Short mmCIF file of all heavy atoms in Angstrom, two decimals:
data_model
loop_
_atom_site.label_atom_id
_atom_site.label_comp_id
_atom_site.label_asym_id
_atom_site.label_seq_id
_atom_site.Cartn_x
_atom_site.Cartn_y
_atom_site.Cartn_z
N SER A 1 43.39 56.44 139.36
CA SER A 1 41.93 56.50 139.33
C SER A 1 41.32 55.52 140.34
O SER A 1 40.18 55.69 140.75
CB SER A 1 41.44 56.14 137.89
OG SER A 1 40.01 56.32 137.76
N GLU A 2 42.12 54.51 140.74
CA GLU A 2 41.69 53.58 141.75
C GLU A 2 41.85 54.16 143.15
O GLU A 2 41.49 53.53 144.17
CB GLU A 2 42.45 52.26 141.64
CG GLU A 2 42.29 51.61 140.26
CD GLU A 2 42.89 50.20 140.24
OE1 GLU A 2 44.14 50.07 140.20
OE2 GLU A 2 42.09 49.24 140.25
N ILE A 3 42.43 55.37 143.23
CA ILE A 3 42.59 56.09 144.46
C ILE A 3 41.63 57.29 144.50
O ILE A 3 41.99 58.34 144.01
CB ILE A 3 44.07 56.60 144.66
CG1 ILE A 3 45.03 55.46 144.41
CG2 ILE A 3 44.21 57.21 146.02
CD1 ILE A 3 46.51 55.92 144.45
N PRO A 4 40.41 57.06 145.00
CA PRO A 4 39.35 58.04 144.96
C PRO A 4 39.77 59.41 145.44
O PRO A 4 40.62 59.52 146.33
CB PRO A 4 38.26 57.45 145.88
CG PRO A 4 38.89 56.33 146.60
CD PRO A 4 39.98 55.82 145.67
N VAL A 5 39.20 60.45 144.88
CA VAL A 5 39.47 61.83 145.30
C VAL A 5 38.71 62.17 146.57
O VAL A 5 37.60 61.73 146.83
CB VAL A 5 39.06 62.84 144.19
CG1 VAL A 5 39.93 62.61 142.97
CG2 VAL A 5 37.61 62.77 143.83
N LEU A 6 39.37 62.91 147.44
CA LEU A 6 38.77 63.33 148.72
C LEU A 6 37.88 64.51 148.47
O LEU A 6 38.23 65.47 147.83
CB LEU A 6 39.88 63.66 149.75
CG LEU A 6 40.67 62.46 150.28
CD1 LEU A 6 41.53 61.86 149.17
CD2 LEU A 6 41.58 62.92 151.44
N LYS A 7 36.68 64.48 149.05
CA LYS A 7 35.68 65.50 148.80
C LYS A 7 35.51 66.44 149.98
O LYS A 7 34.78 67.43 149.88
CB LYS A 7 34.33 64.90 148.43
CG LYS A 7 33.81 63.82 149.37
CD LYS A 7 34.33 62.42 148.98
CE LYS A 7 33.71 61.35 149.83
NZ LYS A 7 33.88 61.55 151.28
N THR A 8 36.22 66.14 151.05
CA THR A 8 36.23 67.07 152.21
C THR A 8 37.34 68.10 152.03
O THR A 8 37.10 69.30 152.03
CB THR A 8 36.41 66.33 153.55
OG1 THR A 8 35.60 65.15 153.55
CG2 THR A 8 36.06 67.22 154.73
N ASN A 9 38.57 67.59 151.78
CA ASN A 9 39.73 68.44 151.51
C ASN A 9 39.84 69.64 152.44
O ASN A 9 39.49 70.72 152.10
CB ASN A 9 39.68 68.87 150.05
CG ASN A 9 41.05 69.43 149.61
OD1 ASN A 9 41.90 68.73 149.08
ND2 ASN A 9 41.19 70.74 149.76
N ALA A 10 40.41 69.41 153.65
CA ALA A 10 40.52 70.44 154.63
C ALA A 10 41.95 70.46 155.22
O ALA A 10 42.68 69.46 155.04
CB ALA A 10 39.51 70.28 155.75
N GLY A 11 42.27 71.50 155.88
CA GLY A 11 43.58 71.61 156.52
C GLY A 11 43.48 71.36 158.01
O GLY A 11 42.40 71.14 158.52
N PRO A 12 44.63 71.37 158.70
CA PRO A 12 44.72 71.07 160.16
C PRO A 12 44.10 72.11 161.05
O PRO A 12 44.17 72.05 162.26
CB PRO A 12 46.23 70.92 160.40
CG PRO A 12 46.87 70.93 159.08
CD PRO A 12 45.97 71.70 158.18
N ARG A 13 43.49 73.14 160.42
CA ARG A 13 42.84 74.18 161.16
C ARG A 13 41.43 73.83 161.60
O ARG A 13 41.07 73.97 162.73
CB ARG A 13 42.81 75.47 160.34
CG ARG A 13 44.16 76.10 160.08
CD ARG A 13 44.76 76.75 161.37
NE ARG A 13 45.11 75.76 162.40
CZ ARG A 13 44.58 75.80 163.59
NH1 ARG A 13 43.67 76.70 163.96
NH2 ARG A 13 44.94 74.92 164.51
N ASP A 14 40.65 73.29 160.66
CA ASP A 14 39.33 72.78 161.01
C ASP A 14 39.39 71.32 161.32
O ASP A 14 39.34 70.46 160.47
CB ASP A 14 38.34 72.97 159.81
CG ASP A 14 36.90 72.72 160.21
OD1 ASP A 14 36.55 71.55 160.42
OD2 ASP A 14 36.12 73.68 160.29
N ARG A 15 39.56 71.04 162.62
CA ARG A 15 39.77 69.68 163.09
C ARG A 15 38.59 68.76 162.72
O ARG A 15 38.77 67.56 162.47
CB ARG A 15 39.99 69.64 164.60
CG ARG A 15 41.36 70.15 164.97
CD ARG A 15 41.61 70.06 166.45
NE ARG A 15 43.03 70.03 166.79
CZ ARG A 15 43.83 71.08 166.96
NH1 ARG A 15 43.28 72.31 166.85
NH2 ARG A 15 45.06 70.94 167.30
N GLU A 16 37.39 69.27 162.65
CA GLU A 16 36.25 68.48 162.34
C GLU A 16 36.37 67.95 160.86
O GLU A 16 36.27 66.75 160.64
CB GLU A 16 34.94 69.27 162.43
CG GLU A 16 33.71 68.50 162.01
CD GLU A 16 32.41 69.11 162.50
OE1 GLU A 16 31.90 69.98 161.83
OE2 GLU A 16 31.93 68.66 163.56
N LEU A 17 36.62 68.83 159.95
CA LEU A 17 36.79 68.47 158.53
C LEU A 17 38.10 67.74 158.32
O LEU A 17 38.24 66.92 157.46
CB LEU A 17 36.66 69.67 157.64
CG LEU A 17 35.31 70.30 157.58
CD1 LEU A 17 35.15 71.15 156.31
CD2 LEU A 17 34.20 69.21 157.55
N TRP A 18 39.09 68.08 159.20
CA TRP A 18 40.39 67.45 159.22
C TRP A 18 40.25 65.98 159.52
O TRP A 18 40.77 65.16 158.77
CB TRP A 18 41.28 68.17 160.22
CG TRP A 18 42.58 67.46 160.45
CD1 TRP A 18 42.96 66.79 161.56
CD2 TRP A 18 43.72 67.41 159.54
NE1 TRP A 18 44.24 66.31 161.39
CE2 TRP A 18 44.70 66.69 160.18
CE3 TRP A 18 43.99 67.90 158.23
CZ2 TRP A 18 45.93 66.43 159.59
CZ3 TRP A 18 45.17 67.66 157.66
CH2 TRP A 18 46.15 66.89 158.35
N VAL A 19 39.50 65.67 160.54
CA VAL A 19 39.26 64.25 160.92
C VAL A 19 38.54 63.51 159.83
O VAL A 19 38.73 62.32 159.66
CB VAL A 19 38.49 64.17 162.28
CG1 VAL A 19 38.16 62.71 162.61
CG2 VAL A 19 39.28 64.77 163.40
N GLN A 20 37.70 64.21 159.08
CA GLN A 20 37.00 63.63 157.97
C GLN A 20 38.02 63.28 156.83
O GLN A 20 38.06 62.16 156.31
CB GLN A 20 35.94 64.53 157.38
CG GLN A 20 34.67 64.59 158.24
CD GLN A 20 33.49 65.13 157.48
OE1 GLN A 20 32.60 65.79 158.02
NE2 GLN A 20 33.42 64.81 156.16
N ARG A 21 38.82 64.27 156.47
CA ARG A 21 39.81 64.09 155.43
C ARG A 21 40.85 62.97 155.84
O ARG A 21 41.31 62.26 155.03
CB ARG A 21 40.59 65.36 155.13
CG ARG A 21 41.20 65.39 153.74
CD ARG A 21 42.42 66.32 153.67
NE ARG A 21 43.62 65.60 154.12
CZ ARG A 21 44.74 66.23 154.54
NH1 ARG A 21 44.77 67.56 154.60
NH2 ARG A 21 45.82 65.55 154.88
N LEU A 22 41.06 62.96 157.12
CA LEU A 22 42.03 61.99 157.70
C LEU A 22 41.59 60.54 157.40
O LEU A 22 42.39 59.74 156.91
CB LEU A 22 42.13 62.20 159.21
CG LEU A 22 43.49 61.95 159.86
CD1 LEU A 22 43.87 60.48 159.78
CD2 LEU A 22 44.58 62.82 159.15
N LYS A 23 40.35 60.21 157.62
CA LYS A 23 39.86 58.89 157.37
C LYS A 23 39.69 58.62 155.87
O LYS A 23 39.97 57.48 155.43
CB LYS A 23 38.53 58.59 158.08
CG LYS A 23 37.47 59.69 157.89
CD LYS A 23 36.15 59.32 158.56
CE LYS A 23 36.30 58.96 160.06
NZ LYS A 23 36.86 60.09 160.82
N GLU A 24 39.37 59.64 155.09
CA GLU A 24 39.32 59.51 153.62
C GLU A 24 40.75 59.18 153.13
O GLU A 24 40.93 58.25 152.31
CB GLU A 24 38.89 60.84 152.98
CG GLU A 24 37.48 61.30 153.35
CD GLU A 24 37.10 62.56 152.58
OE1 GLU A 24 37.61 63.65 152.90
OE2 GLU A 24 36.25 62.47 151.63
N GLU A 25 41.69 59.89 153.64
CA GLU A 25 43.08 59.81 153.24
C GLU A 25 43.68 58.46 153.69
O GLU A 25 44.39 57.81 152.90
CB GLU A 25 43.90 60.99 153.86
CG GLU A 25 45.25 61.16 153.33
CD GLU A 25 45.78 62.54 153.55
OE1 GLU A 25 46.06 62.89 154.73
OE2 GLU A 25 45.85 63.35 152.60
N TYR A 26 43.36 58.04 154.87
CA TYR A 26 43.80 56.72 155.37
C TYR A 26 43.27 55.62 154.53
O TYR A 26 44.04 54.69 154.18
CB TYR A 26 43.39 56.55 156.82
CG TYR A 26 44.53 56.44 157.84
CD1 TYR A 26 45.00 57.58 158.44
CD2 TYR A 26 45.10 55.22 158.07
CE1 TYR A 26 46.11 57.49 159.30
CE2 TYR A 26 46.17 55.14 158.97
CZ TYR A 26 46.64 56.27 159.60
OH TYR A 26 47.69 56.14 160.48
N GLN A 27 41.99 55.65 154.19
CA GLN A 27 41.39 54.65 153.34
C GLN A 27 42.07 54.60 151.93
O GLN A 27 42.28 53.54 151.39
CB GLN A 27 39.90 54.88 153.13
CG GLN A 27 39.06 54.43 154.34
CD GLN A 27 39.12 52.93 154.55
OE1 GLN A 27 39.36 52.17 153.60
NE2 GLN A 27 38.97 52.51 155.77
N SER A 28 42.39 55.78 151.44
CA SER A 28 43.10 55.90 150.19
C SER A 28 44.45 55.22 150.23
O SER A 28 44.92 54.56 149.30
CB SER A 28 43.25 57.36 149.81
OG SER A 28 42.02 58.01 149.71
N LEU A 29 45.13 55.40 151.38
CA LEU A 29 46.45 54.77 151.64
C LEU A 29 46.30 53.27 151.69
O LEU A 29 47.04 52.53 151.04
CB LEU A 29 47.07 55.27 152.92
CG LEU A 29 47.42 56.76 152.98
CD1 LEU A 29 47.88 57.17 154.35
CD2 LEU A 29 48.44 57.11 151.93
N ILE A 30 45.31 52.79 152.46
CA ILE A 30 45.07 51.34 152.60
C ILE A 30 44.68 50.71 151.24
O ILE A 30 45.21 49.64 150.90
CB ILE A 30 43.95 51.08 153.62
CG1 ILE A 30 44.34 51.65 155.00
CG2 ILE A 30 43.67 49.59 153.76
CD1 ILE A 30 43.26 51.50 156.04
N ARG A 31 43.85 51.40 150.53
CA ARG A 31 43.43 50.94 149.18
C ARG A 31 44.61 50.74 148.32
O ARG A 31 44.76 49.69 147.65
CB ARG A 31 42.46 51.94 148.56
CG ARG A 31 42.13 51.73 147.09
CD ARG A 31 41.68 50.30 146.79
NE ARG A 31 40.65 49.83 147.75
CZ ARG A 31 40.50 48.56 148.12
NH1 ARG A 31 41.27 47.63 147.64
NH2 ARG A 31 39.53 48.25 149.00
N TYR A 32 45.51 51.68 148.29
CA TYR A 32 46.72 51.66 147.42
C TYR A 32 47.62 50.52 147.89
O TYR A 32 48.09 49.72 147.05
CB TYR A 32 47.47 53.00 147.47
CG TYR A 32 48.60 53.09 146.47
CD1 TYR A 32 48.37 53.02 145.09
CD2 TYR A 32 49.89 53.25 146.88
CE1 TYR A 32 49.42 53.10 144.20
CE2 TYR A 32 50.93 53.33 146.01
CZ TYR A 32 50.66 53.29 144.65
OH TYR A 32 51.72 53.39 143.73
N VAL A 33 47.86 50.36 149.16
CA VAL A 33 48.69 49.35 149.72
C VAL A 33 48.13 47.94 149.40
O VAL A 33 48.85 47.03 148.96
CB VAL A 33 48.93 49.49 151.22
CG1 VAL A 33 49.75 48.34 151.77
CG2 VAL A 33 49.60 50.82 151.53
N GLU A 34 46.83 47.79 149.62
CA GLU A 34 46.13 46.52 149.35
C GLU A 34 46.25 46.16 147.90
O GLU A 34 46.65 45.06 147.50
CB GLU A 34 44.64 46.63 149.72
CG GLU A 34 43.96 45.30 149.78
CD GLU A 34 42.47 45.44 149.96
OE1 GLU A 34 42.01 45.69 151.08
OE2 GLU A 34 41.73 45.35 148.97
N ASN A 35 45.93 47.18 147.06
CA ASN A 35 45.99 47.07 145.60
C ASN A 35 47.38 46.61 145.18
O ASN A 35 47.54 45.72 144.30
CB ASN A 35 45.67 48.42 144.98
CG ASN A 35 45.11 48.27 143.58
OD1 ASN A 35 44.57 47.25 143.18
ND2 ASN A 35 45.28 49.32 142.78
#
């Protein structure tokens, strides 16, 4: 629950939304590692 859900949720086809999910996902990774 401390790892927020991604609200863009896109695949590698739509690079625009992909780049959005990418930063969401990266932050989720950093959050978990920091935690």
Side-chain angles (χ1 to χ4, degrees):
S1 186
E2 302 189 284
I3 309 174
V5 295
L6 289 67
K7 51 274 187 303
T8 317
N9 193 90
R13 292 288 68 238
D14 191 289
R15 287 182 156 88
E16 176 164 85
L17 292 198
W18 172 251
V19 175
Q20 286 199 212
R21 203 208 83 200
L22 214 293
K23 47 176 55 59
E24 299 184 286
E25 193 159 69
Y26 244 91
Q27 281 298 331
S28 303
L29 296 175
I30 301 176
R31 170 52 47 210
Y32 188 62
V33 176
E34 195 187 279
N35 205 27

